[PDB]
Ligand binder design. Structure first.
Ligand SMILES: CC(C)[C@H](NC(=O)[C@H](C)NC(=O)OCc1ccccc1)C(=O)N[C@@H](Cc1ccccc1)[C@@H](O)[C@H](O)[C@H](Cc1ccccc1)NC(=O)[C@@H](NC(=O)[C@H](C)NC(=O)OCc1ccccc1)C(C)C
Ligand SMILES: COc1ccc(Br)c(OC)c1C(=O)O
Ligand SMILES: COc1ccc(Br)c(OC)c1C(=O)O
Lengths: 99, 99
């Protein structure tokens, strides 16, 4: 698809067997999801942005389906007000910026 | 151009008489620049990111050039570590996400 930016690029995703929306975010190095339960091991990490830092649980090898495209990578789960798809997954779905 | 996302989507911009690198940021509603002077009498504005909210300065009617594409709009200035080009400007230069 081609997505214009008059509105936030919020798209349907599937993760952990659940339908969610997430922001296709070219300004995010990493993928950061709203607090949710995922099974298995994780490691404590912190990530920084405009407000300072938040603490997140880092999960590896998480599958996310993004507009029907599969991506697998590292996902951080924590107190973000928006699910963020970062560049680690955007490259896997062949996402580019064009102008 | 077509910009892949293996690395940060940094491009050169011109603003306030200064050449700078900035992030083409689809996850940003607004454009936020590192501490600098801009012409005009600013208004206060709150913006929110990972880590919470910060208070920044809003300058309206600011000229910016982004890879040869001229734009005019509102630009925020505050304690960001990276110059961020947000959707308010990305739409003006005809920038889309594609996959
Ligand atoms: C999502 C993260 C992985 C992320 N950071 C990274 O990729 C790397 C690992 N971080 C990094 O390099 O951090 C270094 C450092 C360390 C300490 C503190 C400062 C910075 C990031 O925050 N990326 C942001 C840009 C940036 C990148 C590097 C360093 C600093 C910030 C935006 O691209 C990203 O798209 C976020 C997503 C977001 C939305 C809101 C809450 C949580 C996450 N957008 C934003 O931060 C923008 N906010 C918005 O667009 C919000 C949604 N709108 C808004 O504030 O509108 C005004 C409004 C407020 C209140 C009422 C009325 C209107 C901001 C740049 C303007
Ligand atoms: C550095 O500290 C953390 C980072 C991520 C997480 Br998740 C943490 O646990 C809540 C902690 C901590 O031990 O407080
Ligand atoms: C009013 O919309 C927002 C503005 C800034 C931020 Br930060 C928001 O959180 C993601 C929201 C929102 O929850 O929709």
């Amino acid at each position: 698809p081609q997505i214009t930016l008059a509105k936030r690029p919020l798209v349907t995703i599937k993760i952990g067997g659940q339908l969610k929306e997430a922001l296709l975010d070219t300004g995010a190095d990493d993928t950061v999801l709203e607090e949710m339960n995922l099974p298995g091991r994780w490691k404590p990490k912190m990530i920084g942005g405009i407000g300072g830092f938040i603490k997140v649980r880092q999960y590896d090898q998480i599958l996310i389906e993004i507009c029907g495209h599969k991506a697998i990578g590292t996902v951080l789960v924590g107190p973000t007000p928006v699910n963020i798809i970062g560049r680690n997954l955007l490259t896997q779905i062949g996402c580019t910026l064009n102008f």
